[PDB]
């Protein structure tokens, strides 16, 4: 909350957060850390999802204040929520399915179970029900289990049972292509598991090695077809130099239904590529 020390009888008792002001940069954020002060009486959390694409876990910290009850005001339906405990923290989780997108949002109230005062002080307001205590939630809502190896703290590659994950120096999974040890890996954008094979990103094609997960660069052989990938691993089309001469890496279906970017047999014909001419002898060099 914004603290204007001598503002007069207008000190704000509210913290208003929205999942829509971090749109765009929500892939660069670890966790959202709400910190009330003495005056905070209401915590407005506008849920939503038509704007964002990944929603970070919210943590609501418990401070001393002279208010008897602190409201957490959620604007969503109470029908989708489940609760769990972890040590002294109380976890609420919301799950929805819209447009083949799974929406999973987590709110952790920190150390609310430490004693009777903290336990009784927090109240929750859903859209169709108001003033729901934590004890009432424990008694009337469904419950889930909050523990998994993907929630631990690591700092390098992890191999959880079929699939590899990578954790930053702060212990968060990595999503999207990124460079580690001078190599371009690509971790899937939802499951965060290491991706292998052919990958077309925004109309440019890459190949990620099945052995290590590193993207190929240079002149490579794939299942008896020879491809060429530039300095960044983007597959190239054109006339390029390889250890055996100059060869044609041709567009789709130029000769005998050749795939896009494979070498082809080009005998005794001129070639024109965006204004440059070449000529290929009998041996397609």
């Amino acid at each position: 909350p914004i603290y204007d020390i001598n503002a007069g009888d207008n000190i704000s008792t509210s913290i208003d957060f929205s999942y829509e002001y971090i749109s765009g940069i929500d892939i660069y954020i670890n966790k959202i850390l709400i910190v009330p002060n003495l005056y905070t009486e209401l915590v407005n959390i506008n849920t939503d999802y038509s704007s964002n694409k990944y929603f970070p876990e919210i943590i609501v910290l418990n401070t001393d204040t002279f208010h008897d009850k602190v409201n957490i005001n959620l604007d969503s339906s109470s029908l989708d929520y489940e609760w769990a405990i972890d040590g002294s923290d109380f976890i609420l989780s919301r799950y929805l399915e819209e447009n083949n997108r799974k929406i999973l949002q987590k709110i952790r109230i920190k150390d609310i179970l430490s004693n009777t005062k903290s336990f009784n002080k927090m109240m929750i307001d859903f859209k169709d029900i108001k003033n729901i205590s934590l004890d009432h939630i424990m008694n009337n809502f469904k419950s889930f289990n909050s523990e998994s190896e993907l929630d631990r703290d690591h700092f390098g590659f992890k191999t959880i049972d079929s699939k590899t994950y990578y954790y930053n120096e702060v212990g968060k999974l990595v999503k999207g292509s990124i460079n580690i040890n001078d190599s371009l890996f690509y971790f899937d954008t939802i499951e965060s598991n290491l991706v292998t094979g052919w990958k077309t990103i925004n109309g440019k094609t890459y190949y990620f090695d099945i052995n290590n997960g590193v993207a190929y660069i240079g002149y490579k052989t794939i299942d008896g077809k020879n491809f060429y990938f530039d300095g960044n691993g983007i597959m190239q089309i054109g006339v390029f130099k390889v250890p055996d001469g100059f060869k044609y890496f041709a567009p789709a279906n130029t000769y005998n239904n050749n795939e896009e970017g494979q070498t082809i047999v080009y005998q005794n014909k001129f070639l024109t590529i965006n204004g440059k001419k070449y000529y290929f002898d009998n041996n397609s060099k």
């Binding site: 007069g8 004693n115 702060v170």
Partner: protein, 1084 residues
């Protein structure tokens, strides 16, 4: 003391005029600040009045700007109370109280009492007794005996069925007891109302001889001998000494003594009133004086014995070698090694005087506001109490007792008045009770619901909340937080540590005390009912009287694979990161079936070992394709499980039928420890886990949560922790847990739970399943306090059990007896949840974000500590608010520290000496922080910093912590920051070390004044950004930021600034100006 009036006037500033309540607060604060009296009660009442006024104002103007200051004032008032308490301490009166009501005092109690009398001869011993109630306990025993016999007779056909749920027995017995209690109450009401009043003993004697066929002459003889005994042993009569001056307390005492025969609650009231009227020290009849601190200082405690057993052993050795007390056992002492025994005897026999072994009390200093109470398991207990005559806290405790008893009676009496039987009274009481539940007394109401059953049915615990430690904790909260009549609020342990009875004077771990400590749980209930039935039919019964412990049925792989695995409906949720050994120990049919089912619950991670076939034991596990049962050598596992992080091992057997069983599968503790060692030395070849969780499964294996070190799992953990940690290097002591279960539970195809019973077939006993599930405890070794502790319960499982119970109560096919049983079980589970939250048993998560936030709070503690100390120091040496403390100039002289204060007006420096080390410890700390901000700064130019940029996560985190810590100090606006100034001392030190060579080398007062003015007027920013303040543009050359300097140089029109930037940095602009072009053209 508190801050004075005008400093508050400055702190609590707001634009609006002073409201009336703010005037009242100022008036009360000034009135307090001048109150010169030695009677602490008046100081305390003035604090109370001030606090009430502050609360009124804060509640009326929740949005005001002054509340910040006022709120801190409240905080300070709380601390102030302690300062009042810890002054004017004086020795307690020379009195020693004990209490024994309702029967003849036993000889063992008298020996424990004489031990106190002999070494403390300057203290007046008093044994309080009730001269008109010597036959009450006999009445209670007669009621219980007759009701027990009637109930055993009524169930005589069923009681030989091993399927008997003894809760039916107990409910029937309680109905009979309630009938008889109402009978006696009506008789007493008719008798006492006569013109001539007979005493209680005469009425009890008449009723006993009339109804239960007692011999009147025997009762008279018993009364006479009891009276003469207690009279010859310092007896003091309650009724002769005029204790109950209020009618309400006398009504409570009568309700507890006569209507319920609850001698414990009567003793609670009497102990409080005796302390209130006479003052002194109250002690239980089984507390012994503290042993001298240095007597056994030379003998080292073995690693295999916990601390409590060590104290018990010391007392046993003393009482064996000196023989002060008759029949003091030596059971624990004899198991020691011979060397320790000889050291004990040597150290003892040199000591002649009893005063060389036990410590005198002497003069105990306590204030006239405080009462001190003993501590056990980290929580208060009323075993031993210290109080002056007429203490304040004693009257607080008595008001708490009276309030809780009034809320109970208000609901109980109308329910009794209808004259119904036990069940109808129960139902009406419960409804009238739970109709009034709010957010403040939910836990209290849940706890006192079982008031009618205290002492007759298992797990009734209203006494703890009515007059037990609940009243004391509530009184302490009301005291420190200056309120009245709080229910179920608590102080933090740091504040409870203030009121601790001095431990050096009390030896709580006596032998009578451990026997008093065992509770009327489910274990004792089962094993006492068995005793009743054996003694009523003169028979022999055993659950597994006729089972074969030799059948040795070999594992049928197809029975496991085609029947057990596919029929299982119980999938465990959570982390699958463990490997589960199943070690079957005994060869009967039930052990085999339980092992097979337990394997079927998780076939992929479990291995079976049939140990009973000693030499031929092999490890059977599901093959990697999931279609076949492969086998390996004993205790060996396939490769696919060697990467797991945690081990879970389950021993299966039958436990010997005795309370606190000592043999499991016919193996004592040491035999099973050898078994564990043999298992470990082979197992360590394949896996190095981080956790070990051992189970003991079988009949008669219970989980006790009191007297842990006395039970089988406690001994097992203490004996095997060293082996387990020595063999597996990665395992911490806090990662080894031991549990015990009784029943094996499965889920059928219908969705209901069934348990494999000792007769070979699975019945569906829902009450027993729920109870055994909810009662399980995991024991681990607390390394901080160095003793076994029960781990906090799983709240999710308890909530699931409660939900299942509610659904069962909706099903109307359940008969009313089971409805009553299920309702009691629901109440007990809710009480267990509330106990897990109320006693603060839930342990924090401990990961990175939680470490960060906790370090932030730990830093915020130090600042307030230092602020209070600075207020004190500056106030004593009469240094005003114009002096800034320099944390660089603290010098140590062998007991003291000299600190240099700087005047912000003249620059003159003063030197003050103090004894507090804190000022040094903190002073260097900040000194290091400004030594990291200054370690990534590169030479400044135009009175402005041009810093360095680092993009590694090793040095970026420390710099961010240093900047957050110093920024918090420079923006900290505490109360008590006006007589001292910490926002300015730190700011001036920062400015001096950033733009100069530091305050420590600057002594010229003119330089000091100019630098102080510069620092105070200039605002500095330290937390990492790229363009200090606003957004402009980032041009980071090799590890150097140059956005601000570049934007300054492209508009400066100042030759001095251009020269500085060229000389110290190297920047060179082009100067594309038309005027200069023209000038040079004319020059050429």
């Amino acid at each position: 003391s508190l801050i004075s009036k005008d400093e508050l006037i400055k702190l609590a500033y707001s634009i609006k005029p002073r409201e009336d309540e703010y005037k009242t607060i100022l008036t009360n604060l000034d009135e307090y600040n001048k109150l010169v009296t030695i009677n602490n009660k008046d100081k305390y009442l003035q604090l109370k009045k001030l606090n009430d006024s502050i609360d009124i104002f804060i509640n009326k103007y929740k949005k005001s700007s002054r509340n910040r200051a006022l709120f801190n004032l409240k905080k300070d008032i709380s601390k102030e109370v302690i300062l009042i308490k810890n002054s004017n301490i004086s020795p307690v009166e020379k009195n020693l109280h004990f209490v024994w009501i309702g029967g003849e005092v036993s000889d063992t109690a008298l020996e424990y009492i004489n031990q106190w009398a002999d070494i403390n001869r300057d203290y007046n011993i008093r044994v309080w007794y009730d001269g008109e109630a010597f036959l009450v306990n006999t009445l209670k025993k007669a009621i219980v005996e007759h009701s027990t016999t009637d109930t055993l007779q009524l169930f005589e056909e069923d009681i030989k069925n091993p399927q008997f749920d003894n809760m039916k027995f107990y409910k029937k017995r309680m109905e009979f007891i309630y009938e008889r209690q109402n009978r006696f109450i009506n008789y007493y009401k008719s008798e006492i109302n006569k013109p001539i009043k007979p005493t209680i003993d005469d009425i009890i004697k008449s009723h006993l001889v009339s109804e239960y066929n007692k011999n009147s002459e025997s009762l008279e003889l018993y009364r006479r001998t009891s009276f003469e005994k207690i009279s010859n042993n310092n007896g003091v009569d309650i009724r002769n000494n005029n204790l109950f001056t209020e009618q309400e307390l006398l009504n409570i005492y009568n309700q507890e003594l006569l209507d319920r025969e609850n001698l414990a609650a009567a003793s609670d009231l009497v102990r409080l009133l005796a302390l209130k009227d006479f003052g002194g020290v109250y002690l239980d009849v089984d507390m012994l004086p503290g042993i001298q601190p240095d007597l056994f200082k030379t003998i080292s405690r073995p690693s295999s014995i916990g601390v409590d057993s060590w104290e018990m052993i010391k007392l046993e050795a003393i009482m064996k070698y000196k023989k002060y007390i008759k029949n003091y056992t030596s059971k624990n002492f004899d198991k020691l090694d011979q060397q320790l025994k000889d050291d004990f005897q040597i150290t003892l026999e040199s000591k002649s005087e009893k005063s060389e072994i036990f410590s005198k009390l002497g003069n105990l200093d306590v204030s006239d506001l405080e009462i001190k109470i003993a501590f056990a398991l980290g929580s208060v207990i009323n075993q031993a109490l210290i109080s002056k005559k007429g203490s304040y806290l004693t009257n607080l405790v008595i008001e708490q007792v009276k309030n809780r008893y009034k809320f109970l009676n208000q609901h109980l009496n109308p329910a009794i008045e209808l004259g119904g039987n036990f069940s109808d009274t129960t139902k009406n009481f419960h409804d009238s009770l739970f109709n009034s539940a709010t957010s403040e007394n939910s836990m209290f109401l849940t706890k006192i619901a079982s008031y009618l059953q205290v002492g007759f049915m298992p797990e009734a615990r209203a006494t703890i909340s009515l007059s037990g430690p609940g009243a004391y904790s509530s009184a302490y909260y009301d005291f420190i937080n200056l309120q009245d009549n709080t229910i179920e609020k608590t102080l933090n342990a740091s504040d409870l540590m203030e009121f601790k009875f001095p431990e050096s004077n009390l030896s709580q771990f006596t032998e009578q005390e451990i026997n008093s400590l065992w509770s009327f749980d489910q274990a004792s209930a089962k094993y006492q009912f068995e005793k009743y039935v054996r003694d009523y039919t003169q028979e022999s019964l055993s659950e597994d009287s006729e089972l074969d412990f030799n059948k040795n049925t070999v594992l049928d792989k197809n029975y496991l694979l085609n029947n057990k695995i596919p029929s299982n409906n119980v999938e465990e949720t959570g982390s699958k990161n463990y490997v589960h050994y199943i070690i079957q120990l005994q060869g009967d049919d039930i052990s085999y079936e339980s092992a097979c089912n337990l394997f079927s619950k998780n076939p992929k991670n479990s291995v079976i070992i049939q140990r009973n076939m000693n030499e031929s034991a092999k490890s059977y596990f599901l093959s990697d394709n999931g279609e076949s049962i492969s086998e390996l050598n004993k205790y060996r596992i396939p490769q696919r499980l060697k990467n797991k992080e945690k081990i879970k091992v389950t021993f299966i057997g039958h436990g010997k039928d005795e309370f606190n069983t000592s043999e499991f599968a016919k193996l004592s503790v040491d035999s099973l420890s050898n078994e564990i060692s043999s298992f470990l030395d082979i197992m360590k070849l394949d896996i190095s886990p981080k956790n070990v969780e051992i189970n003991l499964l079988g009949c008669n294996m219970f989980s006790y949560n009191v007297n842990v070190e006395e039970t089988y799992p406690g001994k097992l953990l203490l004996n095997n922790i060293d082996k387990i940690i020595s063999t597996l290097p990665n395992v911490n002591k806090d990662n080894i847990t031991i549990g015990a279960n009784q029943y094996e539970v499965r889920i059928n195809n219908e969705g209901r739970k069934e348990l494999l019973d000792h007769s070979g077939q699975w019945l569906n006993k829902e009450e027993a399943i729920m109870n055994d599930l909810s009662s399980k405890e995991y024991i681990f070794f607390d390394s901080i306090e160095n003793r076994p502790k029960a781990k906090s319960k799983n709240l999710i499982e308890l909530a699931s059990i409660s939900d299942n119970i509610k659904t069962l109560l909706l099903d109307t096919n359940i008969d009313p007896e089971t409805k009553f049983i299920l309702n009691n079980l629901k109440l007990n589970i809710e009480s267990s949840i509330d106990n897990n939250i109320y006693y603060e048993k839930l342990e924090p998560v401990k990961n990175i974000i939680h470490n960060s936030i906790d370090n932030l709070t730990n830093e915020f503690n130090l600042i307030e500590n230092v602020s209070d100390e600075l207020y004190e120091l500056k106030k004593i040496n009469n240094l005003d608010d114009n002096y800034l403390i320099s944390f660089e100039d603290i010098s140590k002289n062998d007991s003291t520290y000299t600190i240099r204060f700087i005047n912000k007006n003249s620059g003159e420096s003063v030197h003050i000496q103090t004894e507090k080390e804190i000022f040094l410890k903190y002073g260097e700390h900040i000194t290091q922080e400004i030594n990291t901000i200054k370690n990534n700064i590169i030479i400044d130019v135009n009175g402005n910093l041009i810093g360095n940029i680092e993009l590694e996560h090793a040095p970026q985190v420390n710099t961010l912590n240093a900047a957050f810590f110093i920024q918090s100090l420079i923006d900290y606006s505490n109360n008590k920051d006006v007589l001292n100034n910490l926002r300015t001392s730190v700011k001036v030190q920062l400015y001096a070390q950033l733009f100069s060579t530091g305050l420590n080398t600057i002594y010229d007062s003119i330089q000091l004044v100019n630098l102080i003015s510069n620092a105070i007027n200039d605002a500095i920013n330290v937390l990492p950004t790229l363009t200090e303040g606003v957004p402009i543009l980032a041009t980071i050359l090799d590890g150097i930021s140059l956005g601000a300097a570049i934007k300054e140089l492209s508009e400066t029109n100042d030759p001095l600034l251009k020269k500085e930037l060229e000389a110290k940095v190297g920047i060179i602009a082009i100067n594309m100006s038309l005027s200069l072009a023209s000038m040079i053209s004319t020059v050429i």
